[PDB]
Curated annotation (Swiss-Prot):
Result when mutating K39I: Abolished serine/threonine-protein kinase activity
N6-acetyllysine modification, residue list: K148
Protein name (Swiss-Prot/TrEMBL): Serine/threonine-protein kinase ULK1
Residues the record marks as active site: D131
Compartments reported by the entry: Cytoplasm, Cytosol; Preautophagosomal structure
Binding site for ATP: I15, G16, H17, G18, A19, F20, A21, V22, V23, K39
Entry comment describing in which tissues the protein is expressed: Ubiquitously expressed. Detected in the following adult tissues: skeletal muscle, heart, pancreas, brain, placenta, liver, kidney, and lung.
Post-translational modification (record): Autophosphorylated. Phosphorylated under nutrient-rich conditions; dephosphorylated during starvation or following treatment with rapamycin. Under nutrient sufficiency, phosphorylated by MTOR/mTOR, disrupting the interaction with AMPK and preventing activation of ULK1. In response to nutrient limitation, phosphorylated and activated by AMPK, leading to activate autophagy. Ubiquitinated via 'Lys-63'-linkage by a complex composed of AMBRA1 and TRAF6 following autophagy induction, promoting ULK1 stability and kinase activity. Deubiquitinated by USP20; leading to ULK1 stability and autophagy initiation.
Family listed: Belongs to the protein kinase superfamily. Ser/Thr protein kinase family. APG1/unc-51/ULK1 subfamily.
Origin: domain of life: Eukaryota
Subunit structure: Interacts with GABARAP and GABARAPL2. Interacts (via C-terminus) with ATG13. Part of a complex consisting of ATG13, ATG101, ULK1 and RB1CC1. Associates with the mammalian target of rapamycin complex 1 (mTORC1) through an interaction with RPTOR; the association depends on nutrient conditions and is reduced during starvation. Interacts with FEZ1; SCOC interferes with FEZ1-binding. Interacts with TBC1D14. Interacts (phosphorylated form) with TRIM5. Interacts with TRIM21 and IRF3, in the presence of TRIM21.
Length: 266
């Protein structure tokens, strides 16, 4: 039914929707075996959806990396926006995690090495993602498994001597400085990553609360945070998690330490 450049899809083939996007499966019109996902406006939140998809194009078209979902093409118009992306045939990390419950340290390591590779590119380009969470990490069996960071609608460029202050992201993964409406930088993404890794290890968030507001109050009242790391956790992973899940961004692990962390060694 619908064409976007050299690609096509039908709205019969719904992959899913959230508040700000609807995704369909599609294919290249010449090479029918090249599958794609086609992200489109969610007209129920039309203005915001259109803004986020346009922001996502602006970032994603600058990123070419095996562990960042590839933007094959896009189409922006006054009243419509489409992104054509590589199809990730494994679904997302949230569904994988819900199934497996918890992952081994070896799997965590493989996934985190890949995420770290993506984060190296973002950091070199001066981009912060701002919505890292398992729902935005996709799995692809190209036959060995690749993780792919997705959903760059909240991402922005942040000049290295500046701070961001837009309240955006998902509260369960937000760095304390973000949810407390303070200024933040690229280290806020490292907290989100710490939370993802913790959740993979344990099956829960390190700091649980009834609501975003309760989570905020928790971080406000607690001047140090110590997540509970299971006794059987390896020493490198314990160390990595404690350094990532530091309440205060000035004490939090920085990118150079993260990239070169012993836990990530082969
Ligand atoms: C193979 O199975 C699946 C493939 C999927 N591919 C993409 C996908 C999304 C992209 F942006 C780019 C390429 C892709 O492949 N996204 C999915 N779900 C998205 C991602 N997490 C939230 C969810 C949604 C629809 C609310 O956004 C998939 C879910 C799947 O199974 C449930
Ligand atoms: Mg984003
Ligand atoms: Mg910060
Ligand atoms: Na760039």
């Amino acid at each position: 039914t619908e064409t976007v450049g050299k690609f096509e899809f039908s709205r019969k083939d719904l992959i899913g929707h959230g508040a700000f996007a609807v995704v369909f499966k599609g294919r290249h019109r010449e090479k029918h075996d090249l599958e794609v996902a086609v992200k489109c406006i969610n007209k129920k939140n039309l203005a915001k959806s259109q803004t986020l998809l346009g922001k996502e194009i602006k970032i994603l078209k600058e990123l070419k990396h095996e562990n960042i979902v590839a933007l094959y093409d896009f189409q922006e118009m006054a009243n419509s926006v489409y992104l054509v992306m590589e199809y990730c045939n494994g679904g997302d990390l949230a569904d994988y995690l819900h199934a497996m419950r918890t992952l081994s340290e070896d799997t965590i390591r493989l996934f985190l090495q890949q995420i770290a590779g993506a984060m190296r590119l973002l950091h070199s380009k001066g981009i912060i993602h701002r919505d890292l969470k398992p729902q935005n990490i996709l799995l692809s069996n190209p036959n060995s498994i690749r993780v792919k960071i997705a959903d760059f609608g909240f991402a922005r460029y942040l000049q290295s001597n500046m701070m961001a202050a837009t309240l955006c992201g998902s509260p369960m993964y937000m760095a304390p400085e973000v949810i407390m409406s303070q200024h933040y930088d690229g280290k806020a993404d490292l907290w989100s990553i710490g939370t993802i890794v913790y959740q993979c290890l344990t099956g829960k968030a390190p700091f649980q609360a009834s609501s975003p507001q309760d989570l905020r109050l928790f971080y406000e009242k607690n001047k140090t945070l110590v997540p509970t790391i299971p006794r059987e956790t390896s020493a490198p992973l314990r160390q990595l998690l404690l350094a990532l899940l530091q309440r205060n961004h000035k004490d939090r692990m920085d990118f150079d330490e993260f990239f070169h962390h012993p836990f990530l060694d082969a």
